Coordinates of N, CA and C and ligand atoms in Angstrom, one line a residue:
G1 N 148.9 -117.2 -62.3 CA 148.3 -118.4 -61.7 C 147.9 -118.2 -60.2
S2 N 147.1 -119.2 -59.7 CA 146.6 -119.1 -58.4 C 147.6 -119.7 -57.4
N3 N 147.5 -119.3 -56.1 CA 148.5 -119.7 -55.1 C 147.8 -120.2 -53.9
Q4 N 148.2 -121.2 -53.2 CA 147.7 -121.7 -51.9 C 148.9 -122.0 -51.0
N5 N 148.8 -121.5 -49.8 CA 149.8 -121.8 -48.7 C 149.1 -122.5 -47.7
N6 N 149.6 -123.7 -47.4 CA 149.0 -124.5 -46.3 C 150.1 -124.5 -45.2
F7 N 150.0 -123.5 -44.4 CA 151.0 -123.5 -43.3 C 150.6 -124.6 -42.3
Ligands
ZN101 ZN1 149.3 -115.8 -60.4

């Protein structure tokens, strides 16, 4: 699956 990090 795809991953997004919103720091
Ligand atoms: Zn993945």
